[PDB]
Write a protein that holds these residues in place. Structure first.
Motif, PDB file in Angstrom:
ATOM      1  N   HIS A   1       0.881  -1.167   0.000  1.00 37.12           N
ATOM      2  CA  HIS A   1       0.000   0.000   0.000  1.00 37.12           C
ATOM      3  C   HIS A   1       0.898   1.190   0.000  1.00 37.12           C
ATOM      4  O   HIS A   1       1.941   1.187   0.670  1.00 37.12           O
ATOM      5  CB  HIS A   1      -0.913  -0.120   1.163  1.00 37.12           C
TER       6      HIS A   1
ATOM      7  N   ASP B   1      -7.320   2.967  -3.185  1.00 35.22           N
ATOM      8  CA  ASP B   1      -7.442   1.889  -2.165  1.00 35.22           C
ATOM      9  C   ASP B   1      -8.141   2.356  -0.919  1.00 35.22           C
ATOM     10  O   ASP B   1      -9.053   1.730  -0.387  1.00 35.22           O
ATOM     11  CB  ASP B   1      -6.055   1.385  -1.792  1.00 35.22           C
TER      12      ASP B   1
ATOM     13  N   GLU C   1     -12.017   0.890   0.187  1.00 36.79           N
ATOM     14  CA  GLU C   1     -12.318   0.228   1.436  1.00 36.79           C
ATOM     15  C   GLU C   1     -13.217   1.048   2.334  1.00 36.79           C
ATOM     16  O   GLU C   1     -14.056   0.510   3.084  1.00 36.79           O
ATOM     17  CB  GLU C   1     -11.008  -0.123   2.174  1.00 36.79           C
TER      18      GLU C   1
ATOM     19  N   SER D   1      -6.912  -4.566   6.715  1.00 33.13           N
ATOM     20  CA  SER D   1      -5.853  -3.784   7.409  1.00 33.13           C
ATOM     21  C   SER D   1      -6.462  -2.926   8.494  1.00 33.13           C
ATOM     22  O   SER D   1      -7.621  -2.570   8.428  1.00 33.13           O
ATOM     23  CB  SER D   1      -5.057  -2.961   6.435  1.00 33.13           C
TER      24      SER D   1
HETATM   25 MG   LIG Z   1      -6.127  -0.766   1.970  1.00 33.24          MG
END
Ligand SMILES: [Mg+2]
Ligand SMILES: NC(=O)C1=CN([C@@H]2O[C@H](COP(=O)(O)OP(=O)(O)OC[C@H]3O[C@@H](n4cnc5c(N)ncnc54)[C@H](OP(=O)(O)O)[C@@H]3O)[C@@H](O)[C@H]2O)C=CC1
Ligand SMILES: NC(=O)C1=CN([C@@H]2O[C@H](COP(=O)(O)OP(=O)(O)OC[C@H]3O[C@@H](n4cnc5c(N)ncnc54)[C@H](OP(=O)(O)O)[C@@H]3O)[C@@H](O)[C@H]2O)C=CC1
Ligand SMILES: CC(C)NC(=O)C(=O)O
Ligand SMILES: CC(C)NC(=O)C(=O)O
Ligand SMILES: [Mg+2]
Ligand SMILES: [Mg+2]
Ligand SMILES: [Mg+2]
Lengths: 328, 329
Positions: free
Chosen positions: A107, A190, A194, B251
């Motif tokens: 990331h 990203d 999410e 995460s």
């Molecule tokens: Mg992520």
């Protein structure tokens, strides 16, 4: 855009290089296993002899402390939490790495928001699987893979992008498709995904749907079959055939109900909220707020996990899943 | 509530009954195939010699016209569109069925909203799979099934529920789990779920997500991998391990982003809307609107399909799916 597959990528750039996988969590376990299965030279580097160290031993690795792993590494991959990476860098990597070792991320948060400033003489690149960690491994084990982005921040060697693509191949992603991006694009898309759909939006849509039915007196088991379990069945159709293939499979009643209510539930106000989310990602504000939340002890995270785990949707769901999934 | 599985249900009450499956579409093909594979006596009844007639022949059936299927049926199952059922009933079933034949539905809409008033001497019952039709079949072919509701509107025989459970077992649903409900509950919950989440909510969430990224200049292929393809991977975790299992897999950054932003996107205003959607289902208003929209020619449905199939999300998605799904040489 070029979508790279196995046939487009050689593993040769990363052969006979020692790849230190720093961490052995959701992504770490999957990368380490899949790269070893792919025949690459993996060492696991960890700060603690705790749960992930035991897990690495149980998977047949002999883990090293981070400082010792990095000292022998040609490629170092940061697969500990984003909020830990700075302290790991400073305490166990910067002064211990071989000079000119590659620094690799999954990331782009730490590099993009200038949290870590890498040495000028290291390649710095990324492979960001577009998948949760356990499915990066599962897919690979089943002979498939998940898509990934690759990106390069520093290309000292002249083959950073080739290395990135080779790691992506090594973890299975080129079985599905790999696209070139940038550290900026990856980090912003990203975070957005999410936040507004993959974690935030879907979890809150599920919980609000289920809880509406249970609050209105319907059987919670019905609620769970309708608003949780069936979602997977529907999303599988989308995954295979798009929104069009899904919509052709559902009843005309459901097509009319969905087309009209969907736009009522997810209306121009929700679209505007997505633009606000994206703005706060692009401005660095989300990253500022996350850093502060982590430095407070991440209570938002822990509080939600404790409330969720004991909530009706999860206790009814655990009971039903155990019944459904007994198998043949 | 009891969740019935295979070991809880006998097929005996529908052995040696002829089951007429009326229709051969998303549910009809799946029910016909799965019941035939289970060993039951199935006949397919159709109004038209068109596409689903040809599909039924291709699948090894010898379809009959509706009137002829129903005349030999002990159990009649309405697996044509909900808006067609009344006309089918009046034109090809009411005056042709055996006296006392069972009348069976997969959704309670027509009975619950009093569109069809059945004869008093027929069992009337339902098996509502909680799945899209093609997955009712696919699950079964893979040795599994999907959950279902069963419900009884009239129990003339004394064994209507047992029959409904037997059909549910025949189509595989008792491999997953079957729960007893009512025509009212199923109709209301089913309409709710497909409106607010399974069709409406998720499709508009996906489109809005994807569209936001493309409008803002990101690569459309990235947007597709992030906002369409990955959803399946995440939802698979939920399906297996609940929301808790999912959230433990992603995460910490994603946990904090999701927990905060999710409640921004899906706020009290959205929850209030869900109560309003429910209210309009419970009051009859949705059913009224649907009937009126059907009688206009379902323009809302067809216009959306045409626009959708040609839209960026779908054209980019077809291209990428074909690339992703080619498989190993
Ligand atoms: Mg992520
Ligand atoms: N999770 C996901 O699916 C995805 C993650 N990413 C990215 O991958 C990277 C890694 O994330 P993810 O896999 O979620 O990480 P995890 O949160 O799973 O990391 C856990 C690992 O980090 C170690 N660790 C945890 N806290 C510390 C600490 N304070 N100091 C030292 N080591 C510690 C753990 O060791 P121990 O066992 O001792 O606690 C364990 O080995 C991030 O950059 C993330 O954004 C990319 C794609 C998706
Ligand atoms: N789709 C789903 O996954 C679910 C549906 N349900 C319920 O199942 C029932 C059946 O729905 P579904 O499977 O979607 O139905 P479909 O829309 O797939 O029905 C298509 C079938 O009906 C026939 N048909 C279409 N129009 C007419 C007409 N005007 N006159 C005569 N026959 C016609 C078609 O024949 P031809 O080939 O000639 O056009 C074909 O055999 C409904 O009660 C629905 O609510 C329950 C659970 C989920
Ligand atoms: C949805 C989730 C798996 N994706 C992520 O990028 C993450 O965990 O950070
Ligand atoms: C989501 C969809 C398959 N469910 C339905 O109940 C339908 O199609 O009517
Ligand atoms: Mg991601
Ligand atoms: Mg349904
Ligand atoms: Mg329905």
């Amino acid at each position: 855009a070029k979508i790279y597959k196995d046939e487009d990528i050689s593993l040769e750039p990363i052969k006979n290089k020692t790849i230190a996988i720093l961490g052995y969590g959701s992504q770490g376990r999957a990368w380490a296993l899949n790269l070893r299965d792919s025949g690459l030279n993996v060492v696991v580097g960890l700060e603690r002899q705790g749960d992930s160290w035991r897990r690495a031993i149980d998977d047949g690795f002999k883990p090293m402390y981070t400082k010792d792993a990095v000292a022998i590494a040609d490629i170092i991959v940061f697969l500990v939490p984003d909020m830990v990476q700075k302290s790991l860098w400073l305490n166990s990597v910067k002064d211990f790495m071989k000079k000119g070792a590659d620094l690799v991320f999954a990331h782009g948060f730490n590099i993009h928001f200038k949290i870590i400033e890498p040495p000028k003489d290291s390649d710095v690149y990324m492979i960001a699987p577009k998948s949760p960690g356990p499915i990066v491994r599962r897919s690979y084990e089943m002979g498939g893979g998940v898509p990934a982005l690759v990106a390069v921040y520093q290309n000292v060697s002249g083959e950073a992008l080739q290395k990135a693509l080779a790691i992506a191949k090594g973890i299975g992603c080129a079985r599905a498709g790999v696209i070139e991006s940038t550290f900026k694009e990856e980090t912003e898309t990203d975070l957005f995904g999410e936040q507004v759909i993959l974690v935030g939006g879907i979890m809150e849509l599920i919980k609000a749907s289920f809880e509406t039915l249970v609050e209105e007196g319907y059987q919670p088991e019905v609620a769970y079959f309708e608003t949780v379990n069936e979602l997977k069945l529907i999303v599988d159709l989308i995954y295979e055939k798009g929104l069009t293939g899904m919509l052709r499979a559902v009843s005309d009643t459901a097509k009319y109900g969905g087309i009209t209510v969907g736009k009522f539930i997810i209306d121009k106000s929700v679209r505007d909220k997505m633009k606000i989310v994206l703005e706060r990602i692009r401005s660095g504000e989300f990253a500022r707020e996350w850093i502060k939340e982590y430095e407070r002890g991440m209570p938002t995270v822990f509080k939600e996990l404790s409330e969720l785990e004991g909530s009706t949707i999860e206790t009814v769901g655990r009971k039903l899943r155990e019944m459904m999934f007994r198998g043949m």
